[PDB]
Write a protein that holds these residues in place. Structure first.
Motif, short mmCIF file in Angstrom:
data_model
loop_
_atom_site.label_atom_id
_atom_site.label_comp_id
_atom_site.label_asym_id
_atom_site.label_seq_id
_atom_site.Cartn_x
_atom_site.Cartn_y
_atom_site.Cartn_z
N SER A 1 -12.49 41.62 26.86
CA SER A 1 -11.24 40.87 26.96
C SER A 1 -10.08 41.81 27.23
O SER A 1 -9.92 42.83 26.56
CB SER A 1 -10.97 40.10 25.67
OG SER A 1 -9.70 39.48 25.73
N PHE A 2 -9.28 41.46 28.24
CA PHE A 2 -8.10 42.25 28.58
C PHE A 2 -6.87 41.41 28.31
O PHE A 2 -6.57 40.47 29.05
CB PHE A 2 -8.11 42.67 30.04
CG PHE A 2 -6.91 43.45 30.44
CD1 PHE A 2 -6.72 44.74 29.95
CD2 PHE A 2 -5.93 42.88 31.24
CE1 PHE A 2 -5.57 45.46 30.27
CE2 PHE A 2 -4.77 43.59 31.56
CZ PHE A 2 -4.59 44.88 31.07
N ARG A 3 -6.16 41.74 27.24
CA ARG A 3 -4.96 41.02 26.85
C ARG A 3 -5.29 39.58 26.51
O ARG A 3 -4.44 38.70 26.63
CB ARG A 3 -3.91 41.07 27.95
CG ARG A 3 -3.43 42.47 28.31
CD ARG A 3 -2.02 42.40 28.87
NE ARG A 3 -1.05 42.01 27.84
CZ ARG A 3 0.22 41.67 28.07
NH1 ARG A 3 0.69 41.65 29.31
NH2 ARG A 3 1.02 41.35 27.06
N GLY A 4 -6.52 39.35 26.06
CA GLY A 4 -6.96 38.01 25.71
C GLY A 4 -6.34 37.42 24.46
O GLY A 4 -5.74 38.12 23.63
N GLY A 5 -6.51 36.11 24.32
CA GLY A 5 -5.97 35.39 23.19
C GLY A 5 -6.78 34.14 22.95
O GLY A 5 -7.72 33.86 23.69
N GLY B 1 -2.51 37.77 34.45
CA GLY B 1 -2.59 39.05 33.78
C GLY B 1 -3.70 39.19 32.76
O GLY B 1 -4.23 40.28 32.57
N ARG B 2 -4.06 38.09 32.10
CA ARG B 2 -5.10 38.13 31.08
C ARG B 2 -6.46 37.88 31.70
O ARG B 2 -6.58 37.17 32.70
CB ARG B 2 -4.82 37.09 30.00
CG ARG B 2 -3.44 37.20 29.42
CD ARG B 2 -3.23 36.28 28.25
NE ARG B 2 -1.86 36.35 27.76
CZ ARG B 2 -1.23 37.48 27.42
NH1 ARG B 2 -1.86 38.64 27.52
NH2 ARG B 2 0.02 37.44 26.98
N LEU B 3 -7.50 38.45 31.10
CA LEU B 3 -8.84 38.29 31.64
C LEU B 3 -9.94 38.55 30.61
O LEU B 3 -9.86 39.49 29.81
CB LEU B 3 -9.01 39.24 32.83
CG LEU B 3 -10.37 39.47 33.50
CD1 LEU B 3 -10.14 40.15 34.84
CD2 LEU B 3 -11.27 40.32 32.63
N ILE B 4 -10.96 37.70 30.62
CA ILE B 4 -12.11 37.85 29.72
C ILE B 4 -13.39 37.80 30.54
O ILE B 4 -13.68 36.79 31.18
CB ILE B 4 -12.18 36.75 28.65
CG1 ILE B 4 -10.91 36.74 27.81
CG2 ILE B 4 -13.36 37.01 27.75
CD1 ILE B 4 -11.00 35.85 26.58
N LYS B 5 -14.15 38.88 30.53
CA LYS B 5 -15.40 38.95 31.26
C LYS B 5 -16.57 38.89 30.30
O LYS B 5 -16.63 39.63 29.32
CB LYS B 5 -15.47 40.24 32.08
CG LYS B 5 -16.78 40.44 32.83
CD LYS B 5 -16.84 41.80 33.53
CE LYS B 5 -18.14 41.97 34.33
NZ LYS B 5 -18.19 43.23 35.12
#
Ligand SMILES: CCCCCCCCCCCCCC(=O)O[C@@H]1[C@@H](CC(=O)NO)CO[C@H](CO)[C@H]1O
Ligand SMILES: [Cl-]
Ligand SMILES: [Zn+2]
Ligand SMILES: [Zn+2]
Ligand SMILES: [Zn+2]
Length: 266
Positions: free
Chosen positions: A247-251, A135-139
Motif C-alpha cells: 500500500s502506498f499512502r493507503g487508507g 496518488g494513493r495505490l494498493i497492489k
C-alpha cells in the motif's frame, strides 16, 4: 491452519475514540463455520465488506439500522491470531480504542485461543490487482503467506517510510498506536469525530514535534499502524488472507475498495 475461537468470553471496555462515549465488547465463542460477526441491539453484523458504511477516519460496519464504528483494530488482531469464529457483542456504537493499538486485544485473545475442527478456508489472492485513487495505490498479488507493506509519505518530519509485516512478526505491529497530525484535529473535531481522542489513545504529530511526552514506540510507528489497519480491513474478505500486499499512502477507503475488488473477481 485450523479454525479458532476463544476458550471463554473476553471483555474489553473503554471510550470509543470517535464517539467519546464509553463502550464494552464481549467476545463470545462460536462453533466452526460461524465466522466473525458483531452483535448490537439484537442485530448480527458480519465482519464483511458488504456491511461497511463509513471509511473516513475509521472503518464502520452497519446493518438494519445498527452501526458499529472502528472495527479495524479488533478485526486486525483477530485476523493476526487466526480467530475465525466469534460473536462480538457491542455495547455502544464504537469499539473501545483503548491505548490506540491492538496490544490489550492481542494479549488477551492470544492467551485464550481454542483450535477447532476445521482447516481454515483462507481467501487467497489468485491474480494480481491494483486499486488507485489520486496518488494513493494498493497492489495485491499471490503469496503463500500474508505479507503487508505500507509506504507512507508524510508532510511532516517522518518524511517517507515503509514497513513490512510477514506472518510471525505480529508483535511488531500490534503495539503501533493510532496517530494524527495536529493540523487534522480541528477538522476531525468539526465533522463530529475524535470526541474520545487524547494523548492516551492517540499519537499526535506536528510538523516537527511529537506531542506525546512518551514519544514514538518505534521510529516508524505510524506506518506500522497503517499496516495494522490494512490487515484489519483485509479481514473483511470473510476469512484469513494469504497474499502479498503493498500500500502506498493507503487508507481505509482504499483498503475497503481493494477488498471489494478482490471479492468481485475471485
Ligand atoms: C492537539 C494536541 C494533542 C492533544 C489532542 C489530541 C486530539 C485527538 C483527536 C482525535 C484523534 C483521532 C485520530 C484519527 O482519527 O486518526 C485517523 C486514523 C484512525 C485509525 O487509526 N484508524 O484505524 C485513520 O486515518 C485517518 C487519516 O486518513 C486519521 O485521521
Ligand atoms: Cl476526511
Ligand atoms: Zn492447516
Ligand atoms: Zn474527515
Ligand atoms: Zn488504526
Amino acid at each position: 491452519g485450523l479454525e479458532k475461537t476463544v476458550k471463554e468470553k473476553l471483555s474489553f471496555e473503554g471510550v470509543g475514540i470517535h464517539t467519546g462515549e464509553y463502550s464494552k465488547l464481549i467476545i463470545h465463542p462460536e462453533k466452526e463455520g460461524t465466522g466473525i460477526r458483531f452483535f448490537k441491539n439484537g442485530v448480527y453484523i458480519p465482519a464483511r465488506h458488504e456491511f461497511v458504511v463509513h471509511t473516513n477516519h475509521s472503518t464502520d460496519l452497519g446493518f438494519k439500522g445498527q452501526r458499529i464504528k472502528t472495527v479495524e483494530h479488533i478485526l486486525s488482531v483477530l485476523h493476526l491470531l487466526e480467530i475465525t469464529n466469534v460473536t462480538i457483542e457491542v455495547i455502544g456504537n464504537e469499539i473501545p480504542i483503548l491505548d490506540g493499538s491492538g496490544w490489550e486485544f492481542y494479549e488477551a485473545i492470544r492467551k485464550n485461543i481454542l483450535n477447532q475442527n476445521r482447516e481454515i478456508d483462507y481467501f487467497v489472492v489468485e491474480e494480481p490487482i491494483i486499486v488507485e485513487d489520486e496518488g494513493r495505490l494498493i497492489k495485491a498479488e499471490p503469496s503463500d503467506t500474508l505479507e503487508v507493506t505500507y509506504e507512507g509519505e508524510f508532510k511532516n518530519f517522518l518524511g517517507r517510510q515503509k514497513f513490512t509485516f510477514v506472518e510471525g512478526n505480529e508483535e511488531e505491529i500490534v503495539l503501533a498506536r493510532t496517530f494524527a497530525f495536529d493540523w487534522e484535529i480541528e477538522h476531525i473535531k468539526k465533522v463530529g469525530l475524535g470526541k474520545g481522542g487524547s494523548l492516551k489513545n492517540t499519537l499526535v504529530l506536528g510538523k516537527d514535534k511529537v506531542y506525546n511526552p512518551e514519544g514514538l514506540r518505534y521510529e516508524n510507528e505510524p506506518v506500522r499502524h497503517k499496516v495494522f489497519d490494512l490487515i484489519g480491513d483485509l479481514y473483511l474478505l470473510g476469512s484469513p488472507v494469504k497474499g502479498k500486499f503493498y500500500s502506498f499512502r493507503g487508507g481505509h477507503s482504499l483498503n475497503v475498495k481493494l477488498v471489494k475488488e478482490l471479492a468481485k473477481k475471485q
